[PDB]
């Protein structure tokens, strides 16, 4: 594994007979620029009224259990971890919770549900914010609850509120919850160029290594390299705000340069792991636990988006996993790594080749794969990987976890034309300006495996 | 052949 340099890019400040073609040759011994346009347009868009920061509704869940803070005996002494059994012979004891959640006459259970049920004998006596219920056991238990099942950090749920069949009085109560919200921000971009049709001073020639070693269209290059401004601001942008709402950077005119996080700084707040060597012990057990708590069994399809060499790192690692399956014998009858290709050289002429493009984990988890060609960027991704590539191709990105009925990722937009253009004849400067912003609604539905050399 | 959204684009867009 070794690279041999096939080109060199030099600036122009460090340097007609007939032609064999009128179309300019573009060698394969030259890296080329890459648009993020195939990546960005895979997401839909959304139109807003103005450049105000925007918020929406966030809905959670309801089923709670309250952690215990401490447990006390009937005289007020706190139960230690090495103490004896508490509440022996159905003797009452106290149970200190950080909230008033359970009510009178209700049966609550510790980490071991239904084995040690505690019956609450009255309302909560407030200790500052704490709630102290004088409880006693409800299972016919004569020996009481052990001291390890009465410590800090034990979850307590509610079961019911039983009474006696005659002359009883009221027990139990009911509980309510509430939702939250989340915001997002915008960003504006500006470009200029002092210009007709000819180049200006920022030039770079490319000279290829072979053995015995026009006129510019400025109106297309300013649009292309301001398209790349809005493609790097939408996708590879970052935020510069505090937790106090203050901005950290100020522009030329005193005002604060307001930026919002792009795609890759909003989707990397959750489900992001940094690995040094890829293994299916890690990816399968991280995609299952995401899908064991969040996804139904039919809806467990993950389309891994990766680069080019990240596909051959997924090929040679499933092949490591498959070759350790000592139960099954893989034949050429079913898999067909060697098939019959019609050839002039022989009657029975063969071929060879295969690639593992999918992996299927237990409980219905299927791990697909596809190649997104913008991970192989020689301009932006410059830290190299020893197995070939630019080490960003070895990043695995799972978009679209589950089904939402609305898009999770979209590109925000102002109604109509939020792009600006302007010429400044003195000096002849073409100014262009645009605003943008990309909202990721739930970043828990985007998972990323990034190599460890791209962090910190 | 113009849908109402298109009349909205031919609208919200500037006249500037």
């Amino acid at each position: 594994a070794g690279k041999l340099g096939k080109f060199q890019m030099l600036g122009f400040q460090h340097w007609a007979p007939q032609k064999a073609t009128n179309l300019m040759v573009q060698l394969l011994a030259f890296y080329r620029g890459k648009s993020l346009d195939t990546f960005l347009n895979s997401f839909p868009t959304r139109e807003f009224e103005d450049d105000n920061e925007y918020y929406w509704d966030v809905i959670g869940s309801s089923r709670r259990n309250i952690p215990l803070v401490e447990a006390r005996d009937e005289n007020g002494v706190v139960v230690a971890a090495n103490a004896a059994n508490v509440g022996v012979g159905t003797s009452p004891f106290y149970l200190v919770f950080p909230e008033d959640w359970f009510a009178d006459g209700e049966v609550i259970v510790g980490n071991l549900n239904q084995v040690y049920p505690f019956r609450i004998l009255g309302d909560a006596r407030m200790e500052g914010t704490n709630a102290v219920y004088k409880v006693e056991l409800m299972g016919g238990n004569t020996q009481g609850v052990p001291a390890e099942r009465l410590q800090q950090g034990e979850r307590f749920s509610i079961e019911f509120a039983p009474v006696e069949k005659e002359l009883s009085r009221k027990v139990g109560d009911v509980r309510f919850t509430s939702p939250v919200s989340m915001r997002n921000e915008w960003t504006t971009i500006r470009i200029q160029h002092k210009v007709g049709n000819k180049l200006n001073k920022k030039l770079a020639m490319g000279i290829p290594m072979v053995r015995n070693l026009w006129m510019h269209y400025v109106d297309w290059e300013v649009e292309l390299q301001f398209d790349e401004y809005k493609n790097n601001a939408m996708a590879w942008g970052t935020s510069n705000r505090n937790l106090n709402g203050e901005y950290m950077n100020f522009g030329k005119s005193g005002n604060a340069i307001k930026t919002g996080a792009g795609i890759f700084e909003q989707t990397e707040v959750a489900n992001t792991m940094y690995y040094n060597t890829f293994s299916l012990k890690l990816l399968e057990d991280a995609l299952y636990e995401l899908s064991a708590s969040k996804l139904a069994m039919d809806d467990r399809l993950f389309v891994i988006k990766t680069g080019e060499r990240g596909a051959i790192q997924f090929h040679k690692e499933v092949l490591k996993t498959v070759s350790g399956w000592t139960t099954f014998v893989l034949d050429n009858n079913s898999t067909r790594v060697v098939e019959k290709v019609q050839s002039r050289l022989h009657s029975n002429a063969l071929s060879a080749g295969f690639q593992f493009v999918e992996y299927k984990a237990p409980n219905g988890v299927r791990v697909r794969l596809d190649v997104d060609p913008f991970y192989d960027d020689p301009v932006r991704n410059k830290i190299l990987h020893p197995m070939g590539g630019v080490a960003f191709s070895y990043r695995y990105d799972i978009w679209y976890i589950g089904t939402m009925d609305q898009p999770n990722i979209f590109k925000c937009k102002i109604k109509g034309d939020n792009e600006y253009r302007g010429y400044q004849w003195g000096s002849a400067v073409i100014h262009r300006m645009a605003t943008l912003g990309v909202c990721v609604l739930d970043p828990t539905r985007t998972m990323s495996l990034i190599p460890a050399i791209l962090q910190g | 052949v113009l849908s109402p959204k298109d009349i909205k684009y031919i609208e919200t867009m500037p006249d500037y």
Binding site: G2, K382, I383 | -
Partner: protein, 73 residues
């Protein structure tokens, strides 16, 4: 951009290597390998053992030789 430098090195624990740069002095020859080589994210693994200039007047002779054995691995 003056002289050519062939390098014999050894990436630590990974293998051995053979490289060739174009710089003015051999300290910059190890710069152009530790930052443009294939171990960019593990540039501390590069251990360059021998740098000698590519001098012309023979123009028929070896410049680097570094074999990895089954008994080194």
């Amino acid at each position: 951009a003056m002289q050519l430098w062939v390098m014999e090195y050894e990436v630590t624990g990974i293998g051995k290597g053979c490289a060739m740069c174009k710089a003015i002095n051999p300290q910059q020859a190890e710069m152009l390998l530790k930052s443009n080589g294939i171990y960019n994210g593990s540039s501390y693994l590069y251990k360059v053992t021998r740098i000698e200039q590519v001098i012309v007047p023979p123009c028929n002779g070896l410049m680097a030789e570094q074999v990895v054995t089954y008994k080194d691995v």
